Amino acid sequence: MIRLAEAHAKMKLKNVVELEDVQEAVRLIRSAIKDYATMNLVQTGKSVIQRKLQEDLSREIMNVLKDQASDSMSFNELIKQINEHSQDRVESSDIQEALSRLQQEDKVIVLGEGVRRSVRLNN
């Protein structure tokens, strides 16, 4: 905004800027925004996006733990309840990914090929 408006008042041959001409200066930015109507990465990636994601994830993990008498949640049952509660569409691949994340985050501790045991989040 600074440099730009400086071009504006450069034009019209102004050695000092009107507080005016900054309006359109903003406006022009507001144009791609007005072209934005019809950073993002994070936004999608926060619950309800990725925070939402892992949150529900852990949530469920906790659940099937509890209902397992704390025994491990299965890869299968995981995927099952996670697409099951259906809604925000947790794709089993995405599932695989976030799972990987928590485990690797030691937000989860689990293993096997077709066996995803549960976690212990120490972190």
């Binding site: 906790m62 733990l65 509890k66 704390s70």
Partner: protein
């Protein structure tokens, strides 16, 4: 509740290691807690959340019950 949860976690950890029947913890740590009772409503609230918490690590994961006679 997470912060309270953290505190209660501390009282529980402390009373557990230090002790090393659920009611006895309720009573000993509420005995401990009465020293910090700022209200009888707080007595009943801490009693309530202890009862609830016990209810939680019993009804949910964290517990062990060796024989239901005693357990």
């Amino acid at each position: 509740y997470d912060k309270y949860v953290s505190m209660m976690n501390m009282i529980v950890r402390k009373i557990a290691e230090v002790d090393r029947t659920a009611v006895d913890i309720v009573d000993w740590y509420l005995l401990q807690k009465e020293n910090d009772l700022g209200s009888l409503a707080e007595y009943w609230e801490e009693r309530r959340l202890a009862f609830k918490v016990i209810k939680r690590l019993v009804k949910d994961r964290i517990l062990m019950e060796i024989h239901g006679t005693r357990h």
